Amino acid sequence: ESTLGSDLARLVRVWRALIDHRLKPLELTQTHWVTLYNINRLPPEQSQIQLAKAIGIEQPSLVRTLDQLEEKGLITRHTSANAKRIKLTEQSSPIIEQVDGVISSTRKEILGGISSDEIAVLSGLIDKLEKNIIQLQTK
Amino acid sequence: ESTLGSDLARLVRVWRALIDHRLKPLELTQTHWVTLYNINRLPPEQSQIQLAKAIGIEQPSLVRTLDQLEEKGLITRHTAKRIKLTEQSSPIIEQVDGVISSTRKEILGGISSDEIAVLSGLIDKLEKNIIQLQT
DSSP: OTTHHHHHHHHHHHHHHHHHHHHGGGOOOHHHHHHHHHHHHSOTTOOHHHHHHHHTOOHHHHHHHHHHHHHTTSEEEEEOOOOEEEEEOTTTHHHHHHHHHHHHHHHHHHHTTSOHHHHHHHHHHHHHHHHHHHHHHHO | OTTHHHHHHHHHHHHHHHHHHHHGGGTOOHHHHHHHHHHHHSOSOOBHHHHHHHHTSOHHHHHHHHHHHHHTTSEEEEOOOEEEEOTTHHHHHHHHHHHHHHHHHHHTTTOOHHHHHHHHHHHHHHHHHHHHHTO
């Protein structure tokens, strides 16, 4: 109980570290692969505030990250008829699939130990805690 | 289910923002706290390398944090740079611990102790599977 917040942090840190290790060859930063995954997953017409909310970083850090990714030829930016729109490049195609593939099967292996009845109770409890925090931050 | 990883990362993130928000009257962050808590639970005069190991982060991030805590007169560094809590740090730590543990009680509001135990068991199992895979 007293270490539950820490245990949750460490779990995330250690899950992401593994993904980092598996993605070693591509020479990406952890911020890069998390961003690239969220760019590819998010709907088209959505705002950069919203992209930042999906990723879980502040706007100034998102700006810097996109600059770096543009530099590497993985994304372009475009004036939209909806603020600027982020487009993945053809060049990014193989990297995105590699990033997606590792995230997706890393999750399956990690979940491999436990039952679907057990993750159900886990999702429910994670959601419960989140609700509690949102409520309190509002107050 | 398929958003388990994301959901967990969001939870840790908003949990941390709340603590940041609540520590602001003291001008401390959750990062400052994690460092102090670790220093406090260890024998005095750990090196920066030893502290980064126990906390679980890389050194540059920790060095910045130590710099800030030193300027606030909460720690000193001696010569490796070895870290020591000041006598002024003892009330600050009780105060920060009051907010941490009292915010915790509210975040765990309305969930059973069975749930907390089942939650802890499941986190522990997941972490163990992950450290198996890293070899």
